[PDB]
Every structure is written in structure tokens, then in C-alpha cells.
Amino acid sequence: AEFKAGSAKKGATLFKTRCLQCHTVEKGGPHKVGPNLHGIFGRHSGQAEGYSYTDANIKKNVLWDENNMSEYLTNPKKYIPGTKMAFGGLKKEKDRNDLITYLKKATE
Ligand code: HEC
Numbered sequence: 479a480e481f482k483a484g485s486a487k488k489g490a491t492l493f494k495t496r497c498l499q500c501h502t503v504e505k506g507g508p509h510k511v512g513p514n515l516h517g518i519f520g521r522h523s524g525q526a527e528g529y530s531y532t533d534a535n536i537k538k539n540v541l542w543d544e545n546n547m548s549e550y551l552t553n554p555k556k557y558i559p560g561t562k563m564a565f566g567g568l569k570k571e572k573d574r575n576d577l578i579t580y581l582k583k584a585t586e
Pocket residue numbers: 492493496497498499500501511512513518522523524525526530531532534535551560561562563564565577
């Protein structure tokens with residue numbers, strides 16, 4: 479919850495190895511198990527058009543920014559209990575800073 483800009487090149491590799499299994503970043507991109515993440519920053523949770531969220535994700539109603547995204551990705555089910563995101567998180571703050579630096583641009 480204290481994000482500092484990092485390495486987008488590392489962040490992209492992190493996205494492929496840790497996220498791309500369940501997510502896409504491009505505009506008009508397909509949903510997988512998880513939603514497409516285009517426009518995720520500056521948007522309240524649960525609002526990927528065409529995806530069906532849990533009540534936990536919708537009720538959380540979090541306005542995604544770099545800080546709360548970092549806290550979320552540390553341990554998703556702690557931040558949003560009841561969510562179906564079967565993913566334990568990124569514990570290393572440096573990974574989260576890199577990943578989020580990539581996401582902010584990749585979903586822009
Ligand atoms: C499955 C194997 C997943 C992996 C690996 C990651 N994510 Fe995920 N994510 C997944 C699901 C099924 C969902 C929906 C959860 C629900 O309650 O409906 C999500 C959700 C997110 C969100 C929230 C989207 C929104 O509120 O609009 C974000 C921001 C997100 N996921 C990001 C994310 C990142 C950055 C990941 C790796 C670094 C990642 N997810 C992995 C399924 C899976």
C-alpha cells in the first residue's frame with residue numbers, strides 16, 4: 479500500500495508468468511477465468527463489461543489505484559474475502575511495483 483514506480487519490462491514478464499493465465503490487458507480483449515483488465519485503474523471494482531463477478535468483488539466497490547492494487551495483490555482473499563480469484567498473491571514489494579508499473583500502461 480505504498481507503491482513506487484519500477485521496471486515495466488520486469489512487470490510484463492511477471493504478468494505473463496503470474497496473471498496472463500486468468501487475464502488479458504488489451505481493449506476489447508477476451509475474458510478467461512478472470513476478467514479483462516482494460517481500464518481497470520480509476521474504475522470501481524466489478525465493472526469489466528461482460529464478466530460475471532462474485533458479490534464479494536462487487537460489494538467491495540474499491541476504486542482501483544496503484545496503492546490499493548498493491549495491497550490487493552499482496553493477498554487477494556484477505557483484501558476481498560469471498561472472491562473466487564484462486565491466487566495467493568505477490569509477496570515481494572519489488573514485484574508488485576514492477577507489475578503495477580506495467581499494468582498502468584498495458585491497460586491504459
Ligand atoms: C486465476 C488463476 C487468476 C490469477 C493467476 C490471477 N487472477 Fe485476478 N482474478 C481472477 C478472478 C477469477 C477474478 C475475479 C474474482 C471475483 O471475485 O469475481 C480476478 C480479479 C482480479 C481483479 C479485480 C478485477 C475487477 O475488480 O474489476 C484484478 C485487478 C486482478 N484480478 C488482477 C490480477 C493480477 C494483477 C494478477 C497477477 C499478477 C492476477 N489477477 C492473477 C483470477 C486470477
